[PDB]
């Protein structure tokens, strides 16, 4: 049967980028041509593979990661990028093999009074390794005094809200991102394009 890409692209609610969702796709037939021409996409970039070649290839597993960031940050969802999102929220490896797809979601994820439910990790001591997910909410220590779980001076909550309002400039508007990763192990393949 068909691979459930629509459950990812057509999901009514998306995850915050710090707690990005991952859908493991296996043992199915994938129709990529219909998937990529469904909705209009503002960002469509593939790395290491052509999007028209996927209908010929087989992979052990395909991962569909999805989250929401703002417009000025879509450029960070790419191999070799740095920044608050790429370092502390969602990191792609330098040899990333897959496609990054994004579209404007101002109508869905912005509110008149501001939608503060979408968060991102603002403070972290070290960078994330590729495909790492950190959902910790421990108080960040920015000084020499330990925080002991109490916010204060040099003691910050690590997450920060976006606050999406539909009249903001496109750089501040929310964008839903879907990252397709194509893993090729020395195991029998389960996802072939057709």
């Amino acid at each position, epitope marked *: 049967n068909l691979c459930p890409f629509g459950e990812v692209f057509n999901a009514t609610r998306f995850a915050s980028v710090y707690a990005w969702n991952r859908k493991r796709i296996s043992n199915c037939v994938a129709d990529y041509s219909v998937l990529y021409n469904s909705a209009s996409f503002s960002t469509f970039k593939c790395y290491g593979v052509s999007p028209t070649k996927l209908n010929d290839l087989c992979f052990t597993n395909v991962y569909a990661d999805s989250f929401v960031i703002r417009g000025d940050e879509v450029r960070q969802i790419a191999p070799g990028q740095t*920044g608050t999102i790429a370092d502390y929220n969602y990191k792609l490896p330098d040899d990333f093999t897959g496609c990054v797809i994004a579209w404007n979601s101002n109508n869905l994820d912005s509110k008149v009074g501001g939608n503060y439910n979408y968060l991102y990790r603002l403070f972290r001591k070290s960078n994330l390794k590729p495909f790492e997910r950190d959902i910790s909410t421990e108080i*960040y220590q*920015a*000084g020499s005094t330990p925080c002991n779980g109490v916010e204060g001076f040099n003691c910050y909550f690590p997450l920060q809200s976006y606050g999406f309002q539909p009249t903001n400039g496109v750089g501040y508007q929310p964008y839903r991102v879907v990252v397709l990763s194509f893993e090729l192990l020395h195991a029998p393949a389960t996802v072939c394009g057709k």
Partner: antibody
Amino acid sequence: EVQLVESGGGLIQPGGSLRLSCAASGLTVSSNYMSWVRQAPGKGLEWVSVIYSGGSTFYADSVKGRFTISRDNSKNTLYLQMNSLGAEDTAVYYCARGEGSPGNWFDPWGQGTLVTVSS
Amino acid sequence: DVVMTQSPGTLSLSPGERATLSCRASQSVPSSYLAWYQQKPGQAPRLLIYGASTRATGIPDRFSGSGSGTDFTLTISRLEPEDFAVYYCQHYDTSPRFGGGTKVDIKR
């Protein structure tokens, strides 16, 4: 007792190099967003560089390829290596914790040091 | 990116009056990204207001920020001679941006 003590300013010939220092007390440099902001004589404020706690560095287009921001954790000090200096680089250079973003504003600020590019 | 313009260039008011400083843009900017800084002669800038309307620690009550979208306002009630300074608005789009600054002179 939060302080950012700056030094390293002074006279430098055109095309020369200079390294500024920002010794911190009351916060950990390697654990914060740390920025340099400069102000030319009689002009406004211009952000120049930032270094993340994770190690990432970013620069304004006016100084890319010529400036390098760094830090020394054992000395708890922020640095700014300035190369290929010109008349546009003459300014008071401030260091500050933060990046001017939500939950991450420029606070506190150093006292500033004056760089004079002259022959 | 969004360019923010401050107005007026110079404000001359007597002590006790109310100072109105504007920071405008042709695009709407989320108010959580707006900040105000004060710089007195020979001193470093200090954070006055962040998130458009939240007063920084130790800042007197007469400094208040407000506005949203395309019009942000710094208000200095009960103007004092010590308030002589240049005030900058500040925001982050793809990099930290500072406005041109508004100079507040005090008449006497």
